[PDB]
Amino acid sequence: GPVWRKHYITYRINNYTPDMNREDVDYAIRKAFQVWSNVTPLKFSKINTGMADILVVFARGAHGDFHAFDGKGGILAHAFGPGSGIGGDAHFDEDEFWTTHSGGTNLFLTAVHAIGHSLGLGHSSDPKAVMFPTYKYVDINTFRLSADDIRGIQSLYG
Ligand SMILES: O=C1NC(=O)[C@@](c2ccccc2)([C@]2(c3ccccc3)NC(=O)NC2=O)N1
Ligand SMILES: [Ca+2]
Ligand SMILES: [Ca+2]
Ligand SMILES: [Ca+2]
Ligand SMILES: [Ca+2]
Ligand SMILES: [Cl-]
Ligand SMILES: [Cl-]
Ligand SMILES: [Cl-]
Ligand SMILES: [Zn+2]
Ligand SMILES: [Zn+2]
Ligand SMILES: [Zn+2]
Fold this sequence. Notes:
The chain is α/β, with parallel strands linked by helices. The chain has a single domain (about 1-158), classed as Collagenase (Catalytic Domain) (3-Layer(aba) Sandwich). The protein is about 25% helix and about 15% strand. The strands form two sheets. It has a five-stranded mixed β-sheet with strand order 2-1-3-5-4, with helices on one face. A two-stranded parallel sheet has the order 6-7. Strand 1 (about 10-15), helix 1 (about 20-35) and strand 2 form a beta-alpha-beta unit. The longest helix has 16 residues, at about 20-35. The chain is globular. The chain binds ligand 0D2, calcium ion (4 copies), chloride ion (3 copies) and zinc ion (3 copies). One chloride ion (CL) binds near residues 37 and 43. This is Macrophage metalloelastase.
């Protein structure tokens, strides 16, 4: 792909944004993984110790890779495709204001997109797809992947 060569994938939250209650961050990240397990045989486990496949990091500016962040706006997050070490990891720009609601940038929606990259998906050219390369705020209560996103991930895993 690269794709993960297993269906049991671990993640760990490296650090928490002070923008949100910790329980809200946990829920947003858990649900973002669940979106993808809903349409594939992938199974994600949150681990609290040891080395996870996907490390979730909040950082600002230059943060140890070739993808330095840019302050508020613009780059919200980036993620590496499947592989060892930094492979799979998902980084969120701390200069954004992360929220559960309509203010700032919505963490769950950003994480669904970032995790798609952590799984090996590229971008969609369809403006309505979750994997379109522009952030779009939508209602979480009615949230669904587009057919294009579903076809993409199932091609990789299903
Ligand atoms: O304009 C963008 N800013 C983003 O962070 C990004 C994005 C993030 C979450 C959801 C949709 C879009 C994007 C990005 C980041 C840096 C430069 C360009 C795009 N980060 C990413 O993982 N895919 C992207 O398209 N697109
Ligand atoms: Ca499943
Ligand atoms: Ca990793
Ligand atoms: Ca930014
Ligand atoms: Ca912040
Ligand atoms: Cl922390
Ligand atoms: Cl599952
Ligand atoms: Cl778990
Ligand atoms: Zn980048
Ligand atoms: Zn990074
Ligand atoms: Zn993207």
